[PDB]
Design a binder for these strands. Structure first.
Ligand SMILES: [Ca+2]
Ligand SMILES: [Mg+2]
Ligand SMILES: [Mg+2]
Length: 430
DNA sequence: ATTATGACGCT
DNA sequence: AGCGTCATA
């Protein structure tokens, strides 16, 4: 009772750009704004692979991973923007730079952990205390929360969505105890006020819209964020957890979307996150290991302790290309030419990295896939990375993988390579 | 013939 | 170290 920690110690947000690559392209080309549109890479094979989709286009059933030709069957007027190509491969620089724009804005408000090219966790705990002292027991106006949903509300005794949103928000605010600087619900609420401000600043200064989740930890924040998209934010309180989890498929929780989540369902014979509460910590540990077992026991109760790491910059810089089906590399000349193209992009990105961020990578990781293997990577090998020179890097990469060539002939390569990957890692200050 | 990434766990 | 898992545009 009095000694059970409830995982209400922090306020954590997760900010996620809406259809991010699409917005980057729409900002640049106003003709694409407010239309069904998608971003595609390459174009010759089935019109190109779709990697991002506007909300207008999703309404027609267009999705990521769909071939553009097939998307056009669902959405004939679908508009397309193509990822830039350089050195014969997709080049994602425009999106990486747009991401930096957003991350630098977020960093003005609080410490952020860059979770992906378009999302960051924010630890608001400190910022909330501060704001709480400026407010001095002042109630929080619904006006300060114009895009916020309160998960689980309204309840009890509204035909249209904005009306529901507001009814829910009013119930929440009318119940709030602002007299108490340590109420976790109040802290979450102040968190949401800050996130409205952050989101306003991002949109003002970049033109990009985003959604966000505000809760007591990263898993709940991430889940919350997806509840109302696009261009909205969702507060998931500790109290909302039991109802929310009672019908929440296990696979929806971050880290449970793959094989572990599949085994939780299979081994325990359950479907929903809430059903986990009926097992002891020991039981969960026996099936899923000490760490996972402990994590699951706490998580199904809405509790998680993973910190927002103070890290705004990626830890690795990598360049990758697939060579699918008939394009698999089958000669030594080919392999060396593409290792060079990858190495040239990598050098360019590394040099800029060193200038902007005062660090140097020290390890080069080389990875390939061979025709047949259904794994992302067939083989990984690292070497020293002593100079930012593409010719040297490609030469070193060739050296570490060349023994993979089955071909008895020097000039031929077998089995053919269907993927090449160069990654710079292990940065040190400079 | 989704592709191009990126973080982190296990042994 | 090299491999696997899980994630996102
Ligand atoms: Ca997004
Ligand atoms: Mg995202
Ligand atoms: Mg997405």
């Amino acid at each position: 009772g009095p000694h059970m920690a409830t995982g209400q110690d922090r306020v954590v947000a997760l900010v996620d750009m809406d259809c991010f690559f699409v917005q980057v392209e729409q900002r640049q080309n106003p003709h694409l704004r407010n239309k069904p549109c998608a971003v595609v890479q390459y174009k010759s094979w089935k019109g190109g692979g779709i990697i991002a989709v506007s909300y207008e286009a999703r309404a027609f059933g267009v999705t990521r991973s769909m071939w553009a030709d097939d998307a056009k069957k669902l959405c004939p007027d679908l508009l397309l923007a193509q990822v830039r190509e350089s050195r014969g491969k997709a080049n994602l620089t425009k999106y990486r730079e747009a991401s930096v724009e957003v991350m630098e804005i977020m960093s003005r408000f609080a410490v952020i952990e860059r979770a992906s090219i378009d999302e960051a966790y924010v630890d608001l705990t400190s910022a909330v205390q501060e704001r709480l002292q400026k407010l001095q027991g002042q109630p929080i106006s619904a006006d300060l929360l114009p895009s916020t949903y309160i998960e689980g509300l309204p309840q009890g005794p509204t035909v249209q969505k904005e009306g529901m949103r507001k009814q829910g928000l009013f119930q929440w605010l009318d119940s709030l105890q602002i007299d108490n600087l340590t109420s976790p619900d109040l802290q979450l609420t102040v968190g949401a006020v800050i996130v409205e401000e952050m989101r306003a600043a991002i949109e003002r200064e970049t033109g990009f819209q985003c959604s966000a989740g505000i809760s007591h930890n990263k898993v709940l924040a991430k889940l919350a964020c997806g509840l109302n998209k696009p261009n909205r934010q969702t507060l998931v309180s500790h109290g909302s957890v039991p109802q929310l989890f009672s019908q929440m498929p296990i696979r929806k929780i971050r880290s449970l979307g793959g094989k572990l989540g599949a085994s939780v369902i299979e081994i325990l014979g359950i479907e929903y996150m809430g059903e986990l509460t009926q097992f002891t910590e020991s039981q969960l540990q026996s099936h899923f290991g000490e760490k996972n077992g402990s994590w699951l026991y706490a998580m199904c109760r809405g509790i998680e302790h993973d910190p927002v790491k103070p890290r705004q910059l990626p830890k690795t810089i990598g360049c990758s290309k697939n060579f699918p089906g008939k394009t698999a590399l089958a000669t030594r000349e080919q392999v060396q030419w593409w290792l060079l193209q990858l190495a040239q992009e990598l050098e360019e990105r590394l040099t800029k990295d060193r200038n902007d961020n005062d660090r140097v990578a020290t390890q080069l990781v080389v990875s390939i896939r061979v025709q047949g293997d259904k794994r992302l990577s067939s083989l990984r090998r690292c070497c020293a990375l002593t100079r930012y020179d593409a010719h040297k890097m490609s030469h070193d990469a060739f050296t570490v993988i060349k023994n993979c060539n089955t071909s008895g002939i020097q000039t031929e390569w077998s089995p053919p390579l269907t993927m090449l990957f160069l990654c710079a890692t292990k940065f040190s200050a400079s």
